[PDB]
Symmetry: D2
Subunit: 156 residues, 4 copies
């Protein structure tokens, strides 16, 4: 069990939340950056971010979260698409996460990404893609998932 604030839901030491208002990629990432981590004495230490995903288990959890929350929107295509923190740059091999973590799990639907350069990843929860990732235009207005600053203690 992970501990998270009210309205947020934990998996594997991370806290997530899906937001229902539609934002483009930059505004969405900005929205997530309004959530933070701070020392008890006042200093802001880190910021939130669109979600990153590092295992098939994280991916299945996020997929279920989208499907359970948006049950009447599930189509037979790709929709609903929901923003995560993935950025495809000048070539398909340039992949990064907004939280700056490493790209060590390939969750793309086969064929994807194919809308480069400078496209954005989204969870595509329609029956065609089953939650695995599509790349889209940053200017699309979509729902999105935030993560809280991911952190652990170090002992040494």
């Amino acid at each position: 069990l992970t501990s998270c604030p009210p309205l947020w839901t934990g998996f594997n030491g991370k806290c997530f939340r899906l937001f229902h208002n539609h934002l483009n990629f930059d505004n969405a990432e900005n929205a997530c950056r309004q959530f933070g981590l701070a020392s008890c004495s006042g200093d802001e230490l880190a910021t939130g971010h669109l979600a990153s995903i590092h295992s098939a288990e994280s991916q299945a959890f996020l997929t279920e979260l989208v499907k359970t929350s948006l049950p009447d929107l599930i189509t037979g295509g790709w929709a609903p698409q929901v923003y995560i923190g993935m950025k495809v740059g000048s070539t398909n091999s340039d992949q990064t996460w907004t939280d700056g973590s490493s790209v060590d799990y390939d969750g793309w639907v086969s064929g994807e990404p194919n809308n480069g350069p400078n496209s954005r990843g989204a969870i595509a929860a329609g029956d065609y893609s089953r939650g695995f990732w599509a790349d889209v235009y940053s200017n699309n207005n979509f729902k999105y998932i935030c993560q809280l600053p991911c952190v652990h203690y170090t002992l040494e």
Copy 2:
């Protein structure tokens, strides 16, 4: 912080979840009883339950949970109505919770309950009632909120 399993959300030492399929009151309560608490050695110790509410703060939290999860269904009326564990019996003063806890908070919209005997409580999230409670027929098919067995350590 409260620690809850994935998909569940904690407030004040309790873990809740909103389910989106429509069930009548008895089937809903049944669905919540599929979730339990167990010793690590295997004995089942308690069962889940439609949510109970013991303070204005619990009530505001559950309201926000319904409004954020179901933003497109919010009407100017009572709808969406969502089941909680409240039972009105033979008279209005016979009020009980399915988890067996005490009725020490009155969250009723004024004029409610008015559909007795043997009516059922629901959160009425439309703009008319703001999440405060209506009473209804047990045979209505609604979405519902489950709580996991509420539990604390005793230390002496």
Copy 3:
């Protein structure tokens, strides 16, 4: 990461505490039974217990907890010996835990148990045994480790 009450320390979903006063096996188990688990509505659901151990990792954690708490008592022999919930009955193969969990990890020092029938398990933290288990007389007065009722949520 595990949440425990003050003075108690968590590992892997369980909460443990070492007590410094010396008690025979029965009184010690009794002492741990003063700690409990309870519904928020009043019913007592389970009781504490001398620690059980189900993996090499639980074992190393308990060993470290003893060594770091009693640093001046560590001898080059078996001492200090500290009670856990292990019971050897009429034969060496009759091994049980007081919390009723399964004996699925062999933490015995080679040669142990050898003081049957009806002997008791103890962590032997002297340099000879490195925290691995000796069996002793139930009438020995030792320090001991309690665990709080171990519990998880069930989802199905």
Copy 4:
């Protein structure tokens, strides 16, 4: 309930630990600074510290932690004294904590501080002082209490 790493014990959203080796004030703080907080992607965000205390309840908890851990050392005087992060500067009114939090709770034994300038705080657990603070030389070798970086999420 607070979640802490193994061997550490939580109170009120903070994790603490008592160490049994004697160090002077600077070496003690240094030892606590070996424990940190870090982003999952690698950046070190904060460091540990000698404990700070901000309420009568924090103070009773730390007192109980010292008394339960060191039961044979309790004298009828001040001993055992145990370092916390309190610094008294050039005057008695110059009081600071090493974690940089605010001095908003007075836990001094009456008469203290009286060994300034540049003295240091310690919990004095003997029967004379009951855990409340004495000020001492920085060059005394004592046991000490560390706190892990105290942090919370900001919902802004």
